[PDB]
Amino acid sequence: AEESRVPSSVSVTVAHDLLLAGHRYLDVRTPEEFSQGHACGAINVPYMNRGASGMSKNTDFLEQVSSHFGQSDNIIVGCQSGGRSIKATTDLLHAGFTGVKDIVGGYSAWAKNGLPTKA
């Protein structure tokens, strides 16, 4: 009974219900999105980011992380774009990108609010 690897696709609409549950939201709009910082109730990062997280930058750690862990292991991830990115995520899934939910959009919708929490 393992469930550390489960790739699923959904829309920010259904994820929103889960977002109310208070679950970590991973979003990757663009490396520059990181330079902007974080968000209020939304964690948007470029897949991998070096930090006190224990150093993890999409480069080789994938072999160590994909070894049995996912950068978003058990998380809700979503690319700024949908459909076109949905199949794109499948390419990353082959490299090891499961155990998380694939949401469509994210920052665009959260941006609609205008409440970005960050340093």
What keywords describe this structure?
alpha/beta, Oxidized Rhodanese, domain 1, five-stranded parallel β-sheet, 5 strands, 34% helix, globular, Thiosulfate sulfurtransferase 16, chloroplastic, transferase, EC 2.8.1.1, Thiosulfate_ST/Rhodanese-like, Rhodanese-like_dom_sf
What does this structure look like?
- There is one protein chain.
- The protein has 119 residues and is α/β, with parallel strands linked by helices.
- It has a single domain, classed as Rhodanese-like domain (Oxidized Rhodanese, domain 1, 3-Layer(aba) Sandwich).
- It has five helices and five strands; from the N terminus they run E-H-E-H-E-H-E-H-E-H.
- The chain has helices at residues 12-21, 31-36, 61-65, 84-96, 107-113; strands at 8-11, 25-28, 43-44, 75-79, 100-104.
- It has a five-stranded parallel beta sheet.
- Helix 4 links the parallel strand 4 (75-79) and strand 5.
- The longest helix is centred in the last third of the chain and has 13 residues, at 84-96.
- It is globular, with a radius of gyration of 14 Å.
- The termini are far apart.
- It is classed as structural genomics, unknown function.
- Keywords: At5g66040, cesg, Structural Genomics, PSI, Protein Structure Initiative, Center for Eukaryotic Structural Genomics, unknown function.
- It forms a monomeric assembly.
- The entry is titled "Solution structure of At5g66040, a putative protein from Arabidosis Thaliana".
- The protein: senescence-associated family protein.
